[PDB]
Structures are given as structure tokens and as C-alpha cells.
Amino acid sequence: MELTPREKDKLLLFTAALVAERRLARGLKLNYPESVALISAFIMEGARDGKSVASLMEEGRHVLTREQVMEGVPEMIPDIQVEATFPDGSKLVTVHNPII
């Protein structure tokens, strides 16, 4: 595989998102780290699919709603940023006010 440090670091984000994913499935209101991990992993998969940065900046704002996270969480996340390998290389996706 010849995994570089950045590929291995992203494995950490993916795993954190698996934890969040299962908890949301149980019907829990996500906390701060769970919310950031879930939305972040969503974007990385979008890039693997070949979606554009423009599409993801918008779609990322519909992963979680205010009713699916604990009180105060939406305000603790003014934005979420993550990079992934798009068909045209690494690009940065910034999702402003992802939770509403």
C-alpha cells in the first residue's frame, strides 16, 4: 500500500466517523467531536466519488441538523474543513455553518 503519513492520519478520521455513525444510528444526539468526524468523513467519500468542491461545500451543510446534536454544538462549529484526493488531485473543502 505504501501508506504515507497523511493517508494514515486520515484513517484516524475515518474511524472516528465510524463511532459517530453508529451512535447516530442508535438515535443519540451527537456531541462536538462526533459531529466534526461524521461530516468530515462524508466529504472525503464525496471526493472519492468524483463530486466537485462546489457541490460538497453545499451538501456538507445537510448531513446533520440542529435536532440531531447536543445543545451548543452547532455554535462550536462555525465551519468544517477537510482535504481529500479528487480526480484532479488534493483540494480543500470548507463547509461554513454545517449544522443548522
Partner 1 sequence: MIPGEYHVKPGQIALNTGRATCRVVVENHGDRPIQVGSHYHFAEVNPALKFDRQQAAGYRLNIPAGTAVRFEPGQKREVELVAFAGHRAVFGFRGEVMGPL
Partner 2 sequence: SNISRQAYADMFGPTVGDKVRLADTELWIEVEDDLTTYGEEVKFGGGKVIRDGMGQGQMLAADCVDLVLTNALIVDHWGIVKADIGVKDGRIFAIGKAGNPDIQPNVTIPIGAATEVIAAEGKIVTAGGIDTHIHWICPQQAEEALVSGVTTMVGGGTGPAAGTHATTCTPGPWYISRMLQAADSLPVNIGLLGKGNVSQPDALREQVAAGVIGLKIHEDWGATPAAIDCALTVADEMDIQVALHSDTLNESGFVEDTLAAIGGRTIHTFHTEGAGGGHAPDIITACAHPNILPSSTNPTLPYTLNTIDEHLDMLMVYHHLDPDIAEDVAFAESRIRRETIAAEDVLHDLGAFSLTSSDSQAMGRVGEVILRTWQVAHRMKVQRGALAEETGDNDNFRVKRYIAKYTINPALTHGIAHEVGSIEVGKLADLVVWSPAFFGVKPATVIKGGMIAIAPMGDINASIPTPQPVHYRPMFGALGSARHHCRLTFLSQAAAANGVAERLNLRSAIAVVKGCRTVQKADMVHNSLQPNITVDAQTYEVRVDGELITSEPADVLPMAQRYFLF
List residues near a second copy by CB under 8 A. Answer: 1-3, 7-8, 11-12, 14-16, 18-19, 22-23, 26, 28, 32-33, 36-37, 45, 48-49
Per the listing, cell 472525503 goes with 44
Q: Which does 18 bind (CB under 5 to 8 A by kind): a second copy, partner 1, partner 2, none?
A: a second copy
Per the listing, cell 466537485 goes with 52
Residues pairing with 69 in the sheet: 30
Region 17-56 residues binding partner 2, contact defined as CB under 8 A: 19, 31-34, 36-37, 40, 44, 48, 52-54
Angle between helices 32-49 and 5-26 (to 10 degrees): 120
Selection from 48, 18, 55 nearest residue 33 by Cα: 18
Among 72, 78, 89, 92, binds partner 1 (CB under 8 A): 72
Last residue before each break in the chain (C–N > 2.5 Å) = none
CB closer to partner 2, 3 vs 62? 3
Asked whether 80 and 44 are in contact (CB, 8 A), the reply is no
Stretch that binds partner 1, among 2-10, 45-53, 72-80, 86-94 (CB under 8 A): 72-80
Q: Which residues bind partner 1 (CB under 8 A)?
A: 71-72, 75-76
